[PDB]
Amino acid sequence: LTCDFNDVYKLEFHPNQQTSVTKLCNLTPNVLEKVTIKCGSDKLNYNLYPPTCFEINEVSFRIPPNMMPEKPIYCFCENKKDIINRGIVEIIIPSLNEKVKGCDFTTSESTIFSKGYSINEISNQQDIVCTVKAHANDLIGFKCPSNYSVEPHDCFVSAFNLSGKNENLLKLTNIIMDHYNNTFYSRLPSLISDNWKFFCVCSKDNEKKLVFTVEASISSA
């Protein structure tokens, strides 16, 4: 899931080229996978258009979880001299077949998550507890209001035990902890060998706590 126009799909001119050379780098990421595009550096004078692709010289992004099918996104790494060698990145946008298992504490009409809560629900002392039952390969996540803090701060790297304490987690994968929008994601392993329950908490002084609890059950995928 890298398009390296610097050393892999090389855009170096050849001697006495009459016409362009065009290279195609086609990617089929899964949702939330990281794509990297390398285009240009100190020595290699290449530009990427548009400068950030999916809204040395290097860009990475991850495709968000979406239920709206989209046409591929293209971006162009250009080498000039008028002859232009161009690397064309095509990213097929994966679409989800159902909402992400988990909890959007910021809307009752989430674009992303299976369960949502309106501002009236999360407002005013009992916890709001949102429980998801997850199995092998499930994508899970939650979003808390931007004003809230999340405990533990690195939820999914660590989480709290329904029984014991903070536990460095279960081989969770593609962990995303986006503190800009207080949105957290990860993927259960393809093999879960033991039942595990854990939780993370969002809070804000004088507000109901928002509890995201996961019951991960023995399974195989």
UniProtKB/Swiss-Prot annotation:
Carbohydrate attachment residues: N124, N147, N161, N181
One BP annotation, GO: symbiont entry into host
Superkingdom of the source species: Eukaryota
Disruption phenotype: No visible phenotype. Parasites grow at normal rates in vitro.
Domain 6-Cys: start-end pairs: 1-96, 99-220
GO cellular component: apical part of cell; cell surface; plasma membrane; side of membrane; symbiont-containing vacuolar space
Keyword vocabulary terms for this entry: Cell membrane, Disulfide bond, Glycoprotein, GPI-anchor, Lipoprotein, Malaria, Membrane, Repeat, Signal
Disulphide-bridged cysteine pairs: C3-C25, C39-C77, C53-C75, C103-C130, C144-C202, C155-C200
Record flagged with keyword Glycoprotein: yes
Post-translational modification comment from the UniProt entry: Processed into a soluble form.
Keyword Glycoprotein attached: yes
Coiled coil: none
Assembly and binders: Heterodimer; heterodimerizes with PF41. May form an antiparallel heterodimer with PF41.
Misc. comment: Does not have erythrocyte-receptor-binding ability.
Protein name: Merozoite surface protein P12
Organism expressing this protein natively: Plasmodium falciparum (isolate 3D7)
Species lineage: Eukaryota, Sar, Alveolata, Apicomplexa, Aconoidasida
Gene name linked to the record: PF12
